[PDB]
Design an enzyme around this catalytic site. Structure first.
Site, short mmCIF file in Angstrom:
data_model
loop_
_atom_site.label_atom_id
_atom_site.label_comp_id
_atom_site.label_asym_id
_atom_site.label_seq_id
_atom_site.Cartn_x
_atom_site.Cartn_y
_atom_site.Cartn_z
N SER A 43 0.91 -1.23 -0.12
CA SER A 43 -0.19 -0.20 0.01
C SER A 43 0.68 1.39 0.13
CB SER A 43 -0.94 0.09 1.23
OG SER A 43 -1.95 -0.76 1.04
N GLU A 141 -4.92 -7.24 -6.27
CA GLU A 141 -3.92 -8.15 -6.82
C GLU A 141 -2.43 -7.81 -6.56
OE1 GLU A 141 -6.66 -6.92 -8.29
OE2 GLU A 141 -7.62 -8.75 -9.09
#
Ligand SMILES: O=C(O)C[C@@H]1CC[C@H](NC(=O)Cc2cccs2)B(O)O1
Ligand SMILES: [Li+]
Ligand code: NA
Ligand code: NA
Length: 259
Positions: A43, A141
């Site tokens: 992230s 993904e």
């Protein structure tokens, strides 16, 4: 050898690989450990995503207050902010804050679409001089963190260099730089990582990432100490081919060793 050694020991106890790069913007001193190796972004790409949005706000008036209507089909797990505003939608600025400060996954995918996908974000990073960064896939993904896969990776040095350019340097104008800094300063997800390594009266803005394999996680940050120039640094890990404590401990060694 000597500066490497405490990092090599931390890595050995940890079991996987760690990469560290830290720059003192006052003196130019650095600390480096596996700093040019690739690690999954996870992230942590969402910080650079917000900076790319801000870059587009230099050229498109009103972009940040533009509402994005989205439906339930845009939601994915770990979208705590965008699931709450499903009725009203969110503006580009609101999505950006959510992506940076809560790592909101749906918000990140919506902003990626706005920028032309993973290819568009990668193109923005190329435009500021980062030849290492690559984003290839969407949430979720991009979190697969398959050993040896270069998709969705960068290096600690390239991350730190791009972060510096975007928060302290010339890659954004002041109003955009200050907005990026403020979003990083308000991050809620990093309180066990680099922030756990800094003295209390210093200020920090950071962005974390946590991938799909235990042991693959990261954080980068700008650190404002009292009475000296900011420090920029990045700490990334790859699972052996716990993580939060290792990131904090590597950050401590960096700040202690740094000139
Ligand atoms: O900012 C990070 O430290 C948290 C952020 C969450 C979304 C993304 N992670 C996933 O979706 C799997 C997850 C791991 C842990 C919680 S959810 B991401 O890579 O990291
Ligand atoms: Li304190
Ligand atoms: Na740097
Ligand atoms: Na800048």
């Amino acid at each position: 050898n000597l500066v490497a050694e405490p990092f090599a020991k931390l890595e050995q106890d940890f079991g996987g690989s760690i990469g560290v790069y830290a720059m003192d913007t006052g003196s130019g001193a650095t600390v480096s450990y596996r700093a040019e190796e690739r690690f999954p972004l996870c992230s942590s790409f969402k910080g650079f995503l917000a900076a790319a949005v801000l870059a587009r706000s230099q050229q498109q008036a009103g972009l940040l207050d533009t509402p994005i209507r989205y439906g339930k089909n845009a939601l994915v797990p770990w979208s705590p902010i965008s699931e709450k505003y499903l009725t009203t939608g969110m503006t580009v600025a609101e999505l950006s804050a959510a992506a940076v400060q809560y790592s909101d996954n749906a918000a990140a995918n919506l902003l990626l679409k706005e920028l032309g996908g993973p290819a568009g974000l990668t193109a923005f990073m190329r435009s500021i001089g980062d030849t290492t960064f690559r984003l290839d896939r969407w949430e979720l993904e991009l979190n697969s963190a398959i050993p040896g896969d270069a998709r969705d990776t960068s290096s600690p040095r390239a991350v730190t260099e791009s972060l510096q350019k975007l928060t302290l340097g010339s890659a954004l104008a002041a109003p955009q730089r200050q907005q990026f800094v403020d979003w990083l300063k308000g991050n809620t997800t990093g309180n066990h990582r680099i922030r756990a390594a800094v003295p209390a009266d210093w200020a920090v803005g950071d962005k974390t990432g946590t991938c799909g394999v235990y042991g693959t996680a990261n954080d980068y940050a700008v650190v404002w100490p009292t009475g000296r120039a900011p420090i920029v640094l990045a700490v990334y890990t790859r699972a052996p081919n716990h993580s939060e404590a290792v990131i904090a401990a590597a950050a401590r060694l960096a700040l202690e060793g740094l000139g």
